[PDB]
Amino acid sequence: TCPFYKKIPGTGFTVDAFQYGVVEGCTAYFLTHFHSDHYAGLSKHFTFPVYCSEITGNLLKNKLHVQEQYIHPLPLDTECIVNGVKVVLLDANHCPGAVMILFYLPNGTVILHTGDFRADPSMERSLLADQKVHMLYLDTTYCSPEYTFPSQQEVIRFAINTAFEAVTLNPHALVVCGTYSIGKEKVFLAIADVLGSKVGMSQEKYKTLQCLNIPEINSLITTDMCSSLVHLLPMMQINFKGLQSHLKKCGGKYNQILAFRPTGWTHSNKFTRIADVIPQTKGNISIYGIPYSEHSSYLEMKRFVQWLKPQKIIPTVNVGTWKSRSTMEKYFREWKLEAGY
Numbered sequence: 096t097c098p099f100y101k102k103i104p105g106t107g108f109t110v111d112a113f114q115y116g117v118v119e120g121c122t123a124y125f126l127t128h129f130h131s132d133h134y135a136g137l138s139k140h141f142t143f144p145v146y147c148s149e150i151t152g153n154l155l156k157n158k159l160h161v162q163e164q165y166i167h168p169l170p171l172d173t174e175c176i177v178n179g180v181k182v183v184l185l186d187a188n189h190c191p192g193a194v195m196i197l198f199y200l201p202n203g204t205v206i207l208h209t210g211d212f213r214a215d216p217s218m219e220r221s222l223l224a225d226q227k228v229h230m231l232y233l234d235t236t237y238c239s240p241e242y243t244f245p246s247q248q249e250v251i252r253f254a255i256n257t258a259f260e261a262v263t264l265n266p267h268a269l270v271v272c273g274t275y276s277i278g279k280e281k282v283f284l285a286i287a288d289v290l291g292s293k294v295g296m297s298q299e300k301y302k303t304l305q306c307l308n309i310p311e312i313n314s315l316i317t318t319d320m321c322s323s324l325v326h327l328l329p330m331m332q333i334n335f336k337g338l339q340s341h342l343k344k345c346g347g348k349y350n351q352i353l354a355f356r357p358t359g360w361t362h363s364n365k366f367t368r369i370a371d372v373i374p375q376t377k378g379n380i381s382i383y384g385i386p387y388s389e390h391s392s393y394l395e396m397k398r399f400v401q402w403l404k405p406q407k408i409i410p411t412v413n414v415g416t417w418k419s420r421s422t423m424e425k426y427f428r429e430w431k432l433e434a435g436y
């Protein structure tokens with residue numbers, strides 16, 4: 096049965112609610128982004144209207160085989176009417192195709208559902224600037240001050256400089272980058288660009304990437320592994336055993352591997368600056384964990400909410416324990432007292 100925080104009151108609408116069977120009273124199912132925790136339950140047999148971005152729609156059709164007659168893609172930054180209610184989709188600064196959704200309810204209530212997001216000051220100049228929000232359904236993934244990490248731009252700078260140094264010292268080193276979902280494509284794209292290489296990957300992953308509307312993508316990726324010195328592998332293979340095994344398969348073209356695991360936050364963020372990060376090494380294999388986040392840091396989240404000044408906040412993440420729920424509610428009250436709304 097569908098939890099309350101996935102239902103939009105005053106509407107026929109749910110958000111990211113595909114794993115509950117037919118939801119009583121739902122006339123339109125919204126999907127914020129193509130990550131499995133949110134799409135869980137969709138397939139070619141789904142026969143209700145799904146509302147989403149163009150990019151999400153391309154993934155639904157090609158990877159999950161959802162039939163075309165039920166996919167309803169909407170443009171970003173454009174007022175749309177859905178079953179008699181005005182909606183707007185806004186870029187979430189998450190993975191490709193990820194949206195926040197603004198619902199303008201018949202009674203005058205305005206609701207913002209952030210999906211998954213990485214808050215940014217550029218959001219303060221979207222269509223949000225114009226009007227008041229009564230209810231905010233908030234991605235609270237890192238809602239505690241211990242959660243700090245660098246900008247995406249500092250993390251990419253580190254990765255480009257690390258990769259370019261290693262391969263310039265040893266032309267026979269291979270770079271490997273781990274993946275398990277869409278998102279974080281800048282990591283492997285920026286490294287391949289500095290090295291003058293295409294990124295090499297499986298057919299299944301190439302297919303995924305071709306649904307993302309990335310400009311000049313045919314210029315940046317390939318399935319011909321032999322021609323590439325940046326390879327993508329499943330995240331579970333990014334360990335000394337799985338990397339050794341991979342180096343076997345490269346037919347003595349390479350004698351060293353430098354590998355990257357983009358994670359979210361890890362506790363080494365509490366102690367170590369990005370500049371100072373070092374790898375784990377075994378023989379001719381080194382692995383760097385890099386804190387490339389597609390969710391808000393604590394301070395980013397706080398700034399966004401104190402700018403928005405919502406009347407009520409409903410968390411969508413960390414809601415399963417009373418200790419988490421208490422922690423979040425205490426921070427929301429602090430932010431409101433400090434900013435005076």
Ligand code: NI
Pocket residue numbers: 128130189211
């Ligand atoms: Ni996500």
